[PDB]
Structures are given as C-alpha cells and as structure tokens.
Design a protein around this nucleic acid. Structure first.
Lengths: 218, 125, 82, 100
RNA sequence: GUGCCUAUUCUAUCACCCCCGGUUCCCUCUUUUGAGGUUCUUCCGGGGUUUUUUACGGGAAUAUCCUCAGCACGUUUCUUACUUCUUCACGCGAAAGCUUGGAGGUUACAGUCUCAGGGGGGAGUACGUUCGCAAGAGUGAAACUUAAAGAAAUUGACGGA
RNA sequence: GGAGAACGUACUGGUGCGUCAGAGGUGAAAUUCUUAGACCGCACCAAGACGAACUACAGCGAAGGCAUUCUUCAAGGAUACCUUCCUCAAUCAAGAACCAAAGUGUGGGGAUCAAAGAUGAUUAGAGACCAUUGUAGUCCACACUGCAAACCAUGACACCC
C-alpha cells in the first residue's frame, strides 16, 4: 500500500530532567490523517532507555539497568516522558548467582511523594567470608527474616517519602544500593545487594505543572 | 531514500530492536522501535525458504538476515538491539539453529553493535 | 587403643574432655556465683544457669536474662565465684 | 543382581522422605532432582572473529559483565543422558565417589 | 585474631561557623598553550538548613535503624541429626555385600517385646467370609499340578549397548 | 502443621494496538493458522496457576509428606539448667489413629497438562510407539478410601564395638 516509512513519521522521545540525555531517543509513528493522530498510542508505549546511557555519557556499571518510560506529552516531533521502572535482565543475576550458597530476595511497596506507587524488589548472595572454612556458609531463617525486616523498613520508609525523579537520582547513583549496604553489613553479610526490579504500580497522570517540574527544561 | 524523517540515517545512531525468535521449525526476525506497538517489520527463515526441515536453520537464517538488513537500511535503523528468544517458556533457553548465523550476519551485513538480550519467558508449568 | 593412662584415672587432659553425663560421674555442670548490682552495696547468689531472674533488692530490677545456656549477666553487674 | 545402592536417591540416611520431581527438559518424563545429574553452567557466545566483528562493533562496555554470556542450568537423567553420550557405568567405584 | 553502626549539631572553637567542591596576578612544582592541592595560606562557591545529600561517632547529643543488643568469620569443645564418608573393625556374610549403636559383636548357636515366614506351581483364589458408599480392602483355601523355582558371583556369549 | 494475607512470575485465554506472507508443527511431514487476517512484537487486562535457578548425600516431618512473604495460630524437637516428680517403664493381640497416586460420592473448579475419544502419520499389521490435538481426570472445596518397587526391598527396643 503506502508501505512503512511512507506510513510512519518520526518523533523524538525526550526524558524528564534528571536525565543526562534528554532528547534521548526517538520513535516513529504512522502518518496522521483524519481522526487518526500519532501521539496517543505512545503514551501507552513504554520506553526502555539504559540507565547508564541516559544519565551517564560513560563508564558506569549501572548500564545493566534500563528505565521504563511512558510518554506524557508530545510537543512537536518530541515527546516528554516519565519514569516507570528501572529494570535489568537475566544475565546479571545468573553471573552473580553462585549455587551451593544462599538467596535473600525482598519487595516493598512504598508510595512516593508523587503517588507514583512503586513496588521495589531487592537481592543479595552469601559468602564464606575470607575464610569461613565451612563447606557452603549459609544463614538461618531468623537471619533471613531479620534481614528482610531491616531492608524493607528502609526502603519503604525512605522511598515512600520521596520525589520520583529524585527516587530515580538515588536509584541511578545507587546510593540507595549502598544505603542498604549500610544497614546490612553488621548482620550476616552476603555479598551484594541490588535493586533488581522496580515496578510502577500506580501513576497519577499528568499536569503541565507536574510535567515542568519533572521535565525541567529541554 | 525512504528516509522520510529526521535522518541523517547512519550519521547518528538510530536504534530499533530485532526481536529474534528461533523456534525449532522457523526463525523469526521482528523489528521494533521501542515496543512493537508500532511494529516495523518481521522476517522469517520460513519466509525466506520452504523446506519443512530447515527453516529455523543457520542457512536460512543467514539468508534471512540479508533481506532484513536491506529493508532496515532502507528505513535507516542504523543500530539495532536484538532480543533473542527461543520458542518460549519451553526449550532450555536455547533458540533454533539459525540464531547465530542471522545475528552474526546483521553485523556482517551492516550493523554497529550494541545491546543484545535473551528474552524467552520464565515458566510455572 | 587404651594403655598408658587408666580409664579409672584420668589426669591432666583427661577430665576436661569427659562430657556431662558421661563425666565418670555426672556433677552439676552449672554452678553458682555471687553477683553484685552496682545498684547497691549489696549483692546476690546466682545460678550460672538460671531460666529466670535475679532481682536486686537494693532496687527491684533484674540483672540477667533467662536464656538457655549460661544465663545472660548484664549491665555492669559484677560477679565472682565459689 | 543390584548395581548401585543409593540408586540415585541421595536421601536414605537423612530427612527428605520424598523429593522434587521434574519433567526432564529433554524427554520429559517426570523425575526426582537427585536421580538427575546437574551441572548448571553459564554459556559462551560466538566464534572468535564473529566476535571480532562484533568487538569492533562493540560499542558495548561494563556492568559486571563486559560483554555478557548465557547460562544453562543443565540437568540430565537416563532418558536424555544416554543418547547424549552423557552418564553411564564408569568403572565400579566412581559410581560411588563425587567430583572435585 | 578477623569483618561489620543511616544522616545533622556543640567543644580546645568569637573557630572559612562546620562539612564539601573549586580558582588568572591562591599555594607548591628547572613541567609552564601544563599537573596537584587548600580542616596549608588565601579567595570564592555549594551543601549542613534540601545531610531523608550519602559523607557521623575523643567527649556529647540529635535524626535513627534497632545485636548502631552484638552480628558475622576464624579457632576450641560437646550434646542431638544427618551424615556423607574417609576409613577401619575382625565381624558378619554365599556373595553381592553389610554401621550410629551396618546384615557386626551368634550353630562358641540365648538382652525384650513383636510381626512374618516356612519347595515350587495351583491362587492369594475360590459365591469362603467379614469391612467398605464404591472401588475393592480385610481376612483367606483345598482340589488340581509339578522338579524345580530361586540367589549371588564367575566366566563366557551377545547387544537395535 | 494449620489458618491468613501479599506476590513474584509464567502458562494462557484475552484484550489493545503494530504490522504482515507467512505461520505452525515434524522422523518425513502430516493433520494445524492464514492475509476477515495467522504468527509476530509491544502495552495491557482478564483468568486460573504455580512458587521457578536459588538449594543441597542439605533441613524438617510418625509415616504419608513437607520450599515468597508477612500475618498469624496453636504444635514439635533438640539443646540448657542443681527444676521437680520415684519407676513411673518396654514392647505390644484385640482394639483404635494416621496412609502418596489414583479412584469413589457431594461441590467447587476451567488454565494447563492431559486417561476417554479424535485426528494424523505409520506400519506388515497397528486405534501402538512417534506426531496433532483433545474428552474424563488434574487443582480445589468437600467427602471417603484403602489398595501404592508407600525403599534405610533391612520390626522395634537394647549395649557395645
């Protein structure tokens, strides 16, 4: 018929503020005609941009994560986005897994200041220390429960009360990762600690007002 | 040029994704923007041959990868992320034969590489 | 093996090792101690195995906790032995 | 006559009365985890120069994985093992004594 | 011996107020179209208050988790499991094989209690009988029949191994 | 163990778009789906499920049997003690109380896996292996049952090696 480029036109996906790359990506959409306009279905699209790629221009090991972005406005070719999750993939976990060891996973839900309701998932793995001579060096149920109990407290407590883009700024620079580390070290230690998934559960949609505040300026 | 919007089509990176799907009877090439809500194009080894005993094959895949590159170029998807998947929640997370031939082929056939993924899903049976 | 020794008499290694109800004769493994609350110039008889409490009565409060093994002395409570 | 005591099952002495059966992902009749051998491995990708092609085209960096790799949690039992020249009567005694 | 406490503030301090970052006539450098650093002079900026930043612990508070109760390792016992099982025990066994305190410590036959078993086949069946909704369980034969049946090892043979 | 809650996540089914000449399945294909439009991709929902690698001669459990969380509930064991109490016991016909699968009745229950069946294919035959599905089942509520190479084919209890 028309065929695809003939069909689709091209649009510049743009970040929110606290994003280093801001007119960061693009996307194409079908040629608008009678009734049928391009911008809509894009709000419902979710964009993964790599967390390193967006907020770093370079070397940084957080590139293991990518952020889900759903489109909040289109203005021109360009369309100003918000945060929906920062996730990762399989590979990390598995290189990071070691078997004949031990798992602690945890999730908490906290509502942002924003009312972006987020569920946030965490992970970390045992060790034999320097020289825990012991055959495969695990941890009790008490331990695991107790660690979760500390972990969870912080994350919700700290995350509930916070601005979303800023939830992101901490999640980027992984001061939060470390923060967990702060609580975790005097206990049974493991190695690691990561934010492995973070899920947007709830969103209170737009306000140009909210948008500028989130967007900042391109 | 069917570049009809904010090119300069290889001057700057321009990423889509090829969701590469190799079953054990065919191999699927599915080109996206960034979510297939708007799908670009999807090319198969079966689309590219018929044999009933082949079609997820490196041969076919190698062949397949060519067409795709041509169309891809034609649209200008300078760069491309690959999301390979097996058949699914079944098979041992190892896709049909062709997947390497095709993959290698895209770079061989004109892709600057960056960002590869296995995306076949996690079962509860 | 079993030559130089005596089973009957242990010696210098040989008591330390026998366990409780196979100490040649069992004997109260736990013991008692004397403890002092800095709370007062007055002090208390104590079980090194207690399951409950000591109250100081130079001020009604408890210087140790029930916990299974040796009970937990605490708080700057000073003790000596018998 | 009988050929191998534990007969796979690693539970007689202990406490695990009965234990996790699985379809074995290669044949797929349902079986208990300790009568299947496991050697859950990561897995390598590309040949040398296809990687070289991809390496130059490696506009790809670090995160704990500087170019990533696969991972196959491999679990073999009679059914598939056999054909795959995988698991059988060694010499005697190793049928009782573990890897290093 | 070993790792291990989130974030603020007073003091010798009227302190750069403190912390943090940075500079051309700040400071240092045989460099010089250059490097490094300042809780060193010295200036400026940011933060403390947004530090709920990510970065506290001489004396002390705060925010405050809440073993920031000690935790977590190493090293040392010992109760109980589970060992595995090295490895050892003769022993026991026809072997195969046989641990915690095995199938050991027994025809040198003998701790208790108990169940079961007692050629083979016929049949675990029979209107035999009793539970049981219902499967069928429970209980349970003779007739008839037959010279073996079995077991482990061994070697051999063989394999669509 | 039992009551909770929360979910992860998939399988689907579904939606919602995107597109599109093919899909799909396979020993060989064949039965499948196909341009309403198959697959496909992504969003999202719905649904019912399942707790994935972790996690292992490793834990717990009379046995059967038992793996997110929290929330619980009531339970159990071990270990600890100079606690009290004086054989309290032991093992045990009858007799009771349990027993996986599956079945079985009364109700959920619907997704899948799939007995029944149906289709292919195959064969010499083949209603079989094999395929493609697909009906009962499956999970569960609820009952009931007693049969499970229900295996440490190894009664218990004892004291040792």
């Amino acid at each position: 018929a028309q065929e695809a480029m003939s069909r689709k036109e091209w649009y510049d996906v743009v970040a929110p503020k606290n994003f280093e790359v801001r007119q960061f990506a693009k996307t194409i959409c079908n040629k608008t005609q009678g009734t049928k306009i391009a911008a809509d279905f894009l709000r419902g699209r979710v964009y993964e941009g790599n967390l390193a790629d967006l907020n770093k221009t370079q070397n940084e090991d957080d590139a293991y994560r990518k952020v889900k972005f759903t489109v909040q406005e289109v203005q021109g070719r360009n369309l100003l986005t918000q945060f929906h999750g920062m996730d990762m993939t399989s590979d990390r976990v598995y290189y990071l897994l070691r078997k004949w060891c031990t798992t602690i996973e945890a999730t908490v839900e906290a509502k942002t200041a924003d009312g972006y309701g987020l569920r946030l998932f965490l992970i970390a793995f045992t060790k034999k220390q320097e020289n825990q001579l012991s055959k495969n060096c695990y941890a009790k149920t008490r331990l695991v429960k107790w660690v979760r109990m500390r972990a969870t407290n912080i994350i919700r407590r700290r995350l509930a009360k916070l601005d979303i883009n800023d939830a992101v700024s901490l999640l980027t620079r992984n001061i939060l990762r470390d923060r967990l580390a702060k609580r975790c070290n005097p206990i049974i230690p493991l190695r690691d600690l990561r934010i492995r998934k973070v899920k947007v559960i709830r969103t209170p949609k737009f306000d140009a007002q909210a948008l500028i505040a989130a967007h900042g300026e391109v | 040029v069917k570049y009809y919007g904010s090119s300069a089509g290889k001057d700057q990176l321009v990423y889509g994704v090829v969701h590469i799907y190799a079953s054990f009877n065919d191999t699927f090439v599915h080109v996206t923007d960034m979510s297939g809500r708007e799908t670009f194009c999807k090319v198969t080894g079966g689309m590219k041959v018929k044999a009933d005993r082949d079609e997820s094959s490196p041969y076919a895949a190698m062949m397949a990868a060519q067409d795709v590159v041509a169309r891809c170029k034609e649209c200008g998807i300078n760069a491309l992320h690959v999301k390979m998947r097996a058949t699914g929640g079944v098979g041992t997370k190892s896709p049909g034969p062709g997947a390497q031939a095709a993959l290698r082929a895209l770079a061989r056939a004109g892709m600057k590489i960056g960002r590869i993924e296995d995306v076949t899903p996690v079962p509860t049976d | 093996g079993f030559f130089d020794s005596d089973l009957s008499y242990p010696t210098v290694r040989t008591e330390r090792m026998k366990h409780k109800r196979r100490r040649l004769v069992q004997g109260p493994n736990s013991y008692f101690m004397d403890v002092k609350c800095p709370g007062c110039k007055n002090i208390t008889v104590v079980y090194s195995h207690a399951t409950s409490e000591v109250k100081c009565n130079g001020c009604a409060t408890l210087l140790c906790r029930p916990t299974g093994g040796k009970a937990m002395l605490v708080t700057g409570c000073g003790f000596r032995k018998k | 006559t009988t050929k191998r005591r534990n007969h796979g099952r690693a539970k007689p002495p202990c406490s695990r009365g009965r234990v996790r059966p699985v379809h074995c992902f290669n044949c797929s009749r349902l079986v208990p985890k300790d009568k299947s051998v496991g050697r859950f491995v990561v897995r390598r990708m590309l040949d040398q120069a296809s990687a070289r092609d991809v390496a130059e085209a490696s506009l790809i960096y670090g995160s704990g994985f500087p170019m990533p790799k696969l991972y196959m949690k491999q679990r073999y039992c009679i059914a598939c093992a056999i054909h795959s020249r995988t698991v059988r009567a060694r010499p005697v005694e190793d049928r009782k004594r573990r890897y290093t």
